[PDB]
Each structure stands twice: as structure tokens, then as C-alpha cells.
Ligand binder design. Structure first.
Ligand code: 87S
Length: 109
């Protein structure tokens, strides 16, 4: 059931926002501030920005037809990070730790 699936997606996102993962999830909580120093080229490289607060808003406004569409936005958020940053960047390591949480929960739902 798509409705039951989306309740599980809300549960996965709630865990990603939890204190347990806060040490590595915090760069992903809100949209990237493209006006901050070092991010002048962010909009040139990243055509579709995505963050956990936008995904939470999209869940609340019923913008995902199913778990697949929610999953696509969570993976878009990680892919933006892997695309934009150097592979040795600390933020890329954080994205990987959060993606481990997401992929495990998303697979077992
Ligand atoms: C997804 C993302 N969030 C941020 C970000 C968000 C809020 C406050 C600061 C931020 O800057 C940081 C830079 C280096 C580290 Cl280690 C962590 C975060 C940057 C990026 C990215 N460069 O991709």
C-alpha cells in the first residue's frame, strides 16, 4: 500500500533527523546556503538542490506518489553532495554515513 509506504518514509526521515545521527546528518537538514563563502558555483553545478527539510515538506504536501519518489529525492540530496564536492571532503564522508542509515531502512521497509 502506497499510504503505508509513505508513513514508513516519514519514519525513515524522522530517524535521519534524530539525535543518534546528528553528528553527520546536520549538513543535510536545510537547503545549502548558496550565498555562503565557497558556494558561489553551487547553482552552476547543482541544478536540482535537495535537503531533508524540503523532503519533509514534500511528504507533508503529498508530493510523493510512492516510496520510490521519496527515495529519489533522498538519493538526489546525496548525489548533489557527491557531485559538487571533492571526493576527500569531510561533507562527502558525512553524506556516506547518512546514506548508510537511509539505504538500510529503505531496503527493509
Ligand atoms: C550538503 C552541504 N551542506 C553544507 C553545509 C550546511 C550547513 C552549514 C554548513 C555547511 O557547510 C559544510 C561544510 C563542510 C562540512 Cl564538513 C560540513 C558542512 C555544505 C554542503 C556541501 N558542501 O555539499
Amino acid at each position: 500500500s502506497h499510504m503505508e509506504q509513505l508513513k514508513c518514509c516519514s519514519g525513515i526521515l524522522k530517524e535521519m533527523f534524530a539525535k543518534k545521527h546528528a553528528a553527520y546528518a546536520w549538513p543535510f537538514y536545510k537547503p545549502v546556503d548558496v550565498e555562503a563563502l565557497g558556494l558561489h558555483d553551487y547553482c552552476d553545478i547543482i541544478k536540482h538542490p535537495m535537503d531533508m527539510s524540503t523532503i519533509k515538506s514534500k511528504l507533508e504536501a503529498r508530493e510523493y506518489r510512492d516510496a520510490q519518489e521519496f527515495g529519489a529525492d533522498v538519493r538526489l540530496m546525496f548525489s548533489n553532495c557527491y557531485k559538487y564536492n571533492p571526493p576527500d571532503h569531510e561533507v562527502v564522508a558525512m553524506a556516506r554515513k547518512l546514506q548508510d542509515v537511509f539505504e538500510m531502512r529503505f531496503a527493509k521497509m
